[PDB]
């Protein structure tokens, strides 16, 4: 298990770093506009019906 | 005992090497035990939360 974890980290450290950065940049507008997201999620089912 | 003399010489040298390495890192060993006491408790708490 120690070897497997060390290998996984050594292989996926840069990709996980880039994924963390891109998740940050994706989620910053989502957080800054959370009220709009909540409102449209509340609004959609009645419109769909 | 005589038939294994090369074996006992080898494990004596290996024990000497291991003991010297452990003795030169006595403080690191102490700090390792001290920090190892609660980190497993932290990990158990985290896992039991997400169990």
């Amino acid at each position: 298990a120690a070897g497997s974890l060390a290998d996984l980290l050594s292989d996926n450290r840069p990709l996980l770093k880039d994924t963390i950065g891109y998740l940050d940049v994706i989620q910053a507008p989502l957080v800054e506009q959370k009220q709009e997201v909540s409102d449209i999620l509340v609004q959609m089912p009645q419109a769909l019906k | 005992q005589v038939n294994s003399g090369d074996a006992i010489q080898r494990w004596a040298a290996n024990l000497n090497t291991l003991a010297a390495q452990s003795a030169q890192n006595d403080e690191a060993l102490r700090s390792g035990l001290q920090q190892a006491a609660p980190t497993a408790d932290q990990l158990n708490a985290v896992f039991s939360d997400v169990r």
Partner: protein, 52 residues
């Protein structure tokens, strides 16, 4: 003396069972040091992980 004999024979049995998996046992220390270094590097190089 009986305790000494049983001690020696059980030590032989235990050591044989342990070093049967010699390939993994010999690499135990190297693997634990490597995973320690990898975890330390992963935590060190992503200081913005908490914000994410």
């Amino acid at each position: 003396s009986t305790q000494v004999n049983q001690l020696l024979v059980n030590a032989q049995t235990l050591l044989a069972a342990v070093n049967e998996r010699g390939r993994s046992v010999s690499l135990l220390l190297e693997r634990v040091s490597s995973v320690s270094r990898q975890v330390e590097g992963f935590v060190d190089e992503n200081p913005n992980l908490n914000h994410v």
